[PDB]
Design a binder for these strands. Sequence first.
RNA 1: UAGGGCCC
RNA 2: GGGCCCU
Length: 474
Amino acid sequence: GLIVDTRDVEERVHVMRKTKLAPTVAHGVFNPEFGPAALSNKDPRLNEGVVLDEVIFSKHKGDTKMSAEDKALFRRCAADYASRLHSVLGTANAPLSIYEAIKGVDGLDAMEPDTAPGLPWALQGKRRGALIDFENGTVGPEVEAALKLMEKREYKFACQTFLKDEIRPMEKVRAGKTRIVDVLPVEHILYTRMMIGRFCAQMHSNNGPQIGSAVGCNPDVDWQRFGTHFAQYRNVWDVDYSAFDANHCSDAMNIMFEEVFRTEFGFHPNAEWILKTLVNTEHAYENKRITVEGGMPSGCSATSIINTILNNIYVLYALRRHYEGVELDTYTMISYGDDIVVASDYDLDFEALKPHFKSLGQTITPADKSDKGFVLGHSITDVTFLKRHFHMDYGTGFYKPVMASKTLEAILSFARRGTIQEKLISVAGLAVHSGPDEYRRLFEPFQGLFEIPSYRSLYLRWVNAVCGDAAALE
RNA sequence: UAGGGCCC
RNA sequence: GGGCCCU
Ligand SMILES: [Mg+2]
Ligand SMILES: [Mg+2]
């Protein structure tokens, strides 16, 4: 986005800590080019002359403005995709009750009872459950009143900046490229869910290339679906954006919201409005108050869905900006926020597309930094999506989500106190797909100290999940 | 942490 | 209710 204002007000928003990630036994063994992100402005691992408070915000390099001509075309693209999207999902997009928004519905998990409540509740030591009853699905009086200012379109808010405590490439750690989470007030999340949760539920249940969205998918079983679909195209592209979330422009965002969440689609008129409040935002970080224009806040409700929608619209726009007679079926794609696979039988030229994406403030590069620029003839077994490759299972014939061994090693090398056992079992479900030897190796440093699920048991679990029938009558 | 999915 | 992984 564009930082239009940075100012000091006395009331310190308290965030920075030490990391909670301690190394495991495997760190000594794997020695990964990874480590926890810097959370302190004087972290010794930081390069000489780096300011964390700086780099943290260096993603806001502006809010690209679009011409009337470009705006109109983007609007047609957003209108065209909305049209495909709602034809598939239906138009059952009515608001959710307070209850529904809280407890979830068929396809949408419950709100999280004990995560960050946002501002100003954080500055009063109140916790989310002080404000909302998650057993019963009702709101306390401080939220009810806020709702009321939202039904009235007068509600105002600030985003709370948290540093993300997570593992990173060493290069990026040493650079101060710690990511930030933009925590919104829990009433804003609740109301957005009231406004677009039913839609979101429908998105999750219909995930797939037809709607170009993978939000709600489960890689273990969905890899077979996705694999077979993309297998049948002459060309497949793995496309990388740079700072996708932050570089959404005001115009793109506003127009998308106007085209996709129309009342004629069954949405409450305040769906558009609640969404639009994400365009111009105040961010609280320590003593600082950063006024930003443009960008998606990470960690507002529906953040991944909105990103997925924009991602679909950008591909359509970029191609139409270049070629003629380009329709929704000239290509196919699936997206999860910024992450995307695109495919087409047409010999599209993504190299030529750079400047068209550029018009929305977006910079596309090919996933393989290698040999410079987009090429033709790649297949699905060449690309990555959600940090997984599409490999063929030797024994069922189905595609399986395979994570790179360095990634797995990085992941196994660190954990939070008292969680190794749990984490091990989880990551095991991730590792099974790498095959029995590689599974044995990754887990070797844990032999004797923790319980390691057998390869066989996790393989059999996976088979039953991906096709109950190939368990049964094999 | 918005969320998705999984593990217990 | 706790945890993990991905976006
Ligand atoms: Mg990168
Ligand atoms: Mg990718």
